[PDB]
Paper text:
Driven by the hypothesis that additional DUBs may contribute to the modulation of the ubiquitin network by L. pneumophila, we performed bioinformatic analyses of Dot/Icm substrates to identify proteins of potential DUB activity. This exercise led to the identification of Lem27 (Lpg2529) which harbors a motif distantly similar to members of the OTU superfamily of DUBs. Our results demonstrate that Lem27 displays a broader activity toward ubiquitin chain types with a distinct preference for K6-, K11- and K48-type polyubiquitin chains. Structural analysis reveals that Lem27 harbors an OTU1 fold and that it recognizes ubiquitin via interactions mediated by at least six contact sites. We also provide evidence to show that Lem27 coordinates with the SidC family E3 ligases to regulate protein ubiquitination on the surface of bacterial phagosomes.
Upon subjecting the complex formed by selenomethionine-labeled Lem271-417 and Ub-PA to crystallization screening, we obtained crystals and solved the structure to a resolution of 2.43 Å by single-wavelength anomalous diffraction (SAD) phasing. There are two copies of the Lem271-417-Ub-PA complex in an asymmetric unit (ASU). The two DUB modules of Lem271-417 molecules in an ASU are almost identical with a root-mean-square deviation (RMSD) of 0.249 Å over Cα atoms of 407 residues (residues 1–417), except that there is an approximate 35o rotation of a domain consisting of a bundle of four α-helices (α-bundles) formed by α13-α16 spanning residues 315–417. The Lem271-417 molecule is composed of two distinct domains: a DUB domain spanning the first ~300 amino acids (residues 1–314) and a separate domain consisting of the four α-bundles (residues 315–417). The DUB module with a bilobal architecture assumes the shape of the right hand with one of the lobes giving the appearance of the thumb and forefinger and the other lobe as palm plus the three other fingers. The ubiquitin moiety is being held tightly by the open hand with its carboxyl end being inserted into the catalytic cleft to access the side chain of Cys24. A vinylthioether bond is installed between the side chain of Cys24 from Lem271-417 and the propargylamide reactive end of Ub-PA. In the structure, His304 is found within 3.8 Å of the S-atom of the catalytic Cys which most likely would constitute the key Cys-His catalytic dyad for Lem27. Interestingly, when compared with these OTU-domain containing structures, the finger lobe of Lem271-417 (residues 108–221) appears as an insertion domain (residues 108–221), absent in structures of OTU DUBs of eukaryotic origin. Inspection of the Lem271-417-Ub-PA complex reveals that the DUB domain makes extensive contacts with the distal ubiquitin moiety in the S1 site of Lem27 by multiple pairs of hydrogen bonds with a total buried conserved surface area of approximately 1900 Å2.
Residue numbers in the entry:
A (entry chain D), D (entry chain C): 1 to 75
B (entry chain B): 10 to 416
C (entry chain A): 11 to 417
The structure:
């Protein structure tokens, strides 16, 4: 299945994943395409606390969902 | 020294959009492509007179930085509001295209799930157990949606109103799923996961319905909040804005797979307190720098701009231009020069004539002419304390770039 | 263990509603009339408002305030009064001693950070004596930073006043250097002396910013706290309790300052229902925060205890009001001439259900209750409004059956 | 020398301290007037990062200064 995430570079990337993939695996895939190491990714989707050890299917994250990397910066 | 050129703005509350526009204008001049420039102008909805002023700024010698006056009178008044408008509007555009994919939805749903947990329990419903949420995650609570005045008040009255129907809608769908799993023997573990999913999906639509209801009242409130003059921009809206400026579209395929398609790709990076990220990404074309969560500024990549003035020379120009708006209109009845700005104009041209003069002998005579320009205005500009000090400060700045000027 | 809990209507006024409810329960328990009137004087209540509240405090101390009493008298009168007092005493404390104020201690963080940045833009080496990256949340989530435009105004103020700070610093250090002529100062020691001088100048800068243009920004903070529906934070819940108690810091025979009160009231703050882990007092007022979005009231057992559920209180209050609306009417049935004597017998029969020991005895008091309802049915459905009253009375009864069946 | 702190109970208490006292000892004295253990205290004064190991005199905290305990709770 495809998954999307909005980057910190004003773009959108796509990932190929399976429902059994953990959030940890997704973060590693994000490290592959972006540069962000996993421990710097602040990843959010639909108010869910995406714990590294649980899975996409655990969080009911379905086909073509969009996750978001955040820095929460203001000015 | 990889990337140390920093350019500030006047921002009163508009630092983000000023900083984006300055960063963009440096890019557009570096990529001297007339259809990239015109397409972005079209995306920003600029009128032709504003395009004319900006196009003349893009005509500027690519080896000279934009001055504060060019920035303060041309770039931020035009592009500050234009980029603010586009960023606020594309937020709603994205929400109308696919609401579930929007940062607004993913951030606001946290409050919606929390509130429905509380209201479900006020209604003595056991569905309150299917939610884990104490509204403590800063990854969500620091979203811009929660800084909109009264939005959470309105969300609280919507949730309390709509709770009984949510309970009844859950019951119907759980009845249906029990009859669909008639023939299976489900543990207590599986039944709880099935229920949480049914409630999850209902609550997600509650978040979108709240924003869309009453002719998109609350969705419009968020757009105009982002659009109000001096409202501090967050990085959520910076990214929405850069998606818009590039013309990003998520488009489906022959095979049915979605991939992002751009009109004009521009690599954007975000720095914090001057420092680049620890990791390696691209070599960026636009850099936005956040300072202590209170200011935004522009870092110009070396590959995009390089000034060929020493900084001793750059300080001298900037000081002359800042004499020109502070004192320029005052009268100086000396030969051609009626205004002090007429005199400063000729001083600036004389420094450029010194720099480009071919040999040391010809440079000395342009230096001599520079001194005679100073001689012509000295009686009346020493006839005032503030202008006497400015004439003195001007002279010392000039002396410090003499080693640079003599090459 | 302090487990009553009482909610409010709050549309952003929750802190003050919850404070008012907690206070009125306290004032009724502390039967003292000079405490009650002294608090009313501090809140500036007019006499007709005092009359309404005094009538509520006369209510039987073993019966809780009803939901209608809270919503129609307590929140409209005291919600505004406590909000006004908390905002006004915020300014009072600042005028009394600005440095002792939460406003000063929280805003000064931004002021020092801004002066670090402004000193560096101004090429002063004083920017080195400051450590501050404006990241400490103990300061950044204070209410002062949620005031619209305040940090914008603080930035143009700081840019205005920086050169004067530089000159005043030089003045005092010249004086300090000559005061330390005969001592041999290490360079670290000189750095502590300098950092201290700059610190004291900046502290006055923060207070002067708030006081400038006859207290413009100080007043903006007061009016922000005072605006209807603005969310109260615990800083101002705390200002408010100092005001209500009449706390004054007073110097004594030896010259030592000690707090003096008109009326001491022990206040605690709970989080998400949980009491503090540590042992403090036996509290008289408890305010409960829920997920940083709502405030409610926890009533201590020592301050009031009723043995009716909130549903049981709803049922008995409704019967007492049926007794007042219809009681004088005739009910030609058995011994009962009045409907009010019939309703009283209903009230006693419900209490006999509550106190009946086991499920078998509860079942027979329930049976007698239905036969009481039966006795009056021939005459009570040929009356239009009272048949409707019987239906809601019965549904109210069903709502307290789970509570009544516990014995 | 006296210093003051605003409690989490709507009051003001006083402490007896010396300029050489560490912030840790101040918190111990606060624990000894309120109930709060030191590691639960969020102690505030004039924008200063009061590190447990540094002292009142390190932070230029003079006699009769008022510190503040905060919870930063909203509603």
């Amino acid at each position: 299945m495809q998954i999307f995430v909005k980057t910190l570079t004003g773009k959108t990337i796509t990932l190929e994943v399976e429902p059994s993939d953990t959030i940890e695996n997704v973060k590693a895939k994000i490290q592959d395409k972006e540069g962000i190491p996993p421990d710097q990714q602040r990843l959010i989707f639909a108010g869910k606390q995406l714990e590294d050890g649980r899975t996409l299917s655990d969080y009911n994250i379905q086909k073509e969902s969009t996750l978001h990397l955040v820095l929460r910066l203001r000015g | 020294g990889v990337n140390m050129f920093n350019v500030d703005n006047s921002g009163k509350g508009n630092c983000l959009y000023y900083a984006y526009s300055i960063s963009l204008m440096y890019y557009l001049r570096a990529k001297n492509n007339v259809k990239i420039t015109e397409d972005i102008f079209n995306k920003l909805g600029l009128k032709e007179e504003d395009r004319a002023r900006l196009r003349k700024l893009l005509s500027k010698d690519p080896d000279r930085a934009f001055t504060r006056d060019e920035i303060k009178t041309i770039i931020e008044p035009i592009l500050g509001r234009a980029t603010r408008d586009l960023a606020a509007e594309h937020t709603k555009v994205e929400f109308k295209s696919s609401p579930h994919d929007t940062p607004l939805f993913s951030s606001l749903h946290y409050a919606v799930e929390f509130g429905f947990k509380r209201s479900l329990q006020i209604n003595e419903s056991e569905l309150t157990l299917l939610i884990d949420n104490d509204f403590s995650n800063p990854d969500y609570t620091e979203a811009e949606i929660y800084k909109v005045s009264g939005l959470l008040d309105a969300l609280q009255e919507y949730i309390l109103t709509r709770t009984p129907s949510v309970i009844e809608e859950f019951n119907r769908q759980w009845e249906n799923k029990k009859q669909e799993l008639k023939e299976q023997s489900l543990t207590e573990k599986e039944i709880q996961v099935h229920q949480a999913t049914i409630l999850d999906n209902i609550l997600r639509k509650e978040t979108i319905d709240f924003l869309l209801a009453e002719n998109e009242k609350h969705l419009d409130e968020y757009r105009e909040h982002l659009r109000r003059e001096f409202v501090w921009g967050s990085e959520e809206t910076l990214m929405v804005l850069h998606r818009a400026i590039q013309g990003e579209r998520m488009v489906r395929n022959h095979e049915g797979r979605i991939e992002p398609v751009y009109d004009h790709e521009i690599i954007l990076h975000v720095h914090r307190n001057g420092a680049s990220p620890s990791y390696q990404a691209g070599s960026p074309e636009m850099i936005l720098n956040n300072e202590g969560n209170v200011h935004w500024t522009s870092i110009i990549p070396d590959a995009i701009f390089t000034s060929k003035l020493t900084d001793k020379e750059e300080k001298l120009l900037d000081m002359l231009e800042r004499m020109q708006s502070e004192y320029g209109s005052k009268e100086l009845g000396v030969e051609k020069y009626s205004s002090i700005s007429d005199w400063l104009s000729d001083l600036m041209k004389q420094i450029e004539l010194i720099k480009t003069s071919p040999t040391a002998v010809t440079k000395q005579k342009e230096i001599e002419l520079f001194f005679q320009l100073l001689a012509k205005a000295t009686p009346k500009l020493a006839s005032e304390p503030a202008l006497r000090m400015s004439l003195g400060t001007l002279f010392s700045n000039f002396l410090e770039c003499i080693p640079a000027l003599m090459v």
